Amino acid sequence: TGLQKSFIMRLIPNDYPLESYRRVSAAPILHVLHNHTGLDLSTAINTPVYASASGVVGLASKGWNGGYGNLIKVFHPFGFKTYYAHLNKIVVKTGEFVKKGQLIGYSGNTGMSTGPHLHYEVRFLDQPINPMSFTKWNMKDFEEVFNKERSIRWQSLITIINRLMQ
Amino acid sequence: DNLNLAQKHLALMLIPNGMPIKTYSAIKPTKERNHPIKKIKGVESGIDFIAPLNTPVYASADGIVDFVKTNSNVGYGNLVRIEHAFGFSSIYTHLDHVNVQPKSFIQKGQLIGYSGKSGNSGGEKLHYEVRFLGKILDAQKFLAWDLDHFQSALEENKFIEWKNLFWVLEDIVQLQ
Ligand SMILES: [Zn+2]
């Protein structure tokens, strides 16, 4: 059911976390920074950055962070995490609860960075994850992510998520 | 407070609560015994249910198994650690048998293991911890938290900003 789509989309990361990227084609290049494939989203310094799903800010770290620069890690339900790196400014703290689409920081050029961009990652536990499978995942192209990121045991996760409602 | 039914229901599926073991003779803080890893008293480290061998153990909320040990007789012994939503984790220790595997999804109420005395247990018991971003919480406040006694967990507010959390949950439940 379509109600389940929205609900699922509050909990599991999806869409682009910069507004200008979600507008142009949905309504981006692959880069390994620290052991995981991120996505680099070219954009000017201080471009607002939004949470891809609801969760807790697991880390809001103002540091070098392995070359990530200023870094937010949002911990989502069921072992999903999102990383937002090279930030110029962080407007949430460690332990803050955020909702999907909430402003969490502003883009920058901090850390190991050649020009201003957002470095974005979707993680699931400890296994490699393609971020495009989640950034392209949206309300129209909804079923897609089950066939694009097959390595997640969706059948168990869907069942469990559907049980949460009533 | 002004929290709706749906908010409370979702919270109690996602955040650890209630009894992970349904038979015990007593509950004691682990602080008052020799800690499993750090062999000393005086460590804030959750609680122990004094329970017979092979008493079923249940997951205190939905989530994912991030760590398991089986056939261990040192330290914590056999254990399950579940990662929950919103930074919470629960750990179950000194088990005799483990029923789940690392990386599996978990539902609240699911059988995860059976209590024992494996590791540095001081005998037959379940050792249980609730944690928020790795930080040790008062497990008793989560035990006593249910639909009818909802304030209990909100009293543990040193690390956790409960109003902010329910604001996030309101947005989620608002959909229906
Ligand atoms: Zn990058």
Q: How far apart are CA A165 and CA A8, in angstroms?
A: 11
Ligand 1 center from residue A13 Cα (angstroms):
18
Count of Cβ atoms closer than 10 Å to residue B124 Cβ: 18
DSSP letter for A89, please: E
SS (H, E, C) B13-61: HHCCCCCCECCCCEEEEHHHCCCCCCCCCCCCCCEEEECCCCCEEECCC
Q: How far apart are CA B17 and CA A5, in angstroms?
A: 27
Q: How far apart are CA B133 and CA A120, in angstroms?
A: 22
Closest partner residue to B168 (CB to CB) among A99, A125, A156 is A99
Does B62 sit within 8 Å of A10, measured CB to CB? no
Q: What tokens were used for A93? A: 């703290």
Instruction: Please give, rounded to a whole number of angstroms, the shortest distance from the CA of A69 to a CA of chain B.
Output: 21
List chain A domain ranges.
1-15+130-166, 16-129
Residue holding tokens 């009818």? B148
Closest partner residue to A54 (CB to CB) among B87, B107, B172 is B172
Does A100 sit within 8 Å of B160, measured CB to CB? no
Method of elucidation: X-ray
**What one-character-per-residue DSSP string does B58-102 give?**
E-SSSEEEEEEE-S--STT-EEEEEE-GGGEEEEEEEEEEE---T
Numbered residues of the known binding site of A: 31, 40, 119
Helix, strand, or coil (residue A66) = helix
User: What is the number of residues in chain A?
Assistant: 166
Is residue B108 within 8 A of residue B13, CB to CB? The reply is yes
Q: How far is C-alpha A27 from the geometric centre of its chain's CA atoms?
A: 18
Q: How far apart are CA B126 and CA A142, in angstroms?
A: 43
> Taking Cα atoms as reference points, which of B92, B79, B108 lies closest to residue B12?
B108
Q: What are phi and psi of A110, to 5 degrees?
A: -75, 165
Helix, strand, or coil (residue A134) = helix
Residue B85 sits at the chain A interface (C-beta within 8 Å) = yes
Q: What are phi and psi of A48, to 5 degrees?
A: -60, 140
> Residues with Cβ < 8 Å from A121, sequence gap 6 or more?
A36, A37, A38, A39, A81, A82, A83, A85, A129, A131
Q: How far apart are CA A5 and CA A12, in angstroms?
A: 10
Residue A93 sits at the chain B interface (C-beta within 8 Å) = no
Q: Please, after which residues is chain B broken with C–N above 2.5 Å?
A: none
Q: How far apart are CA B151 and CA B153, in angstroms?
A: 6
Q: Which helix (H) or strand (E) holds A155?
A: helix A154-163
CA-nearest residue to B102 within chain A is A125
Numbered residues of the known binding site of A for Zn(2+): 31, 40, 119
Q: How far apart are CA B14 and CA B43, in angstroms?
A: 27
Instruction: Please give, rounded to a whole number of angstroms, the shortest distance from the CA of A12 to a CA of chain B.
Output: 11
Ligand 1 center from residue A69 Cα (angstroms):
11
Q: How far apart are CA A13 and CA A57, in angstroms?
A: 14
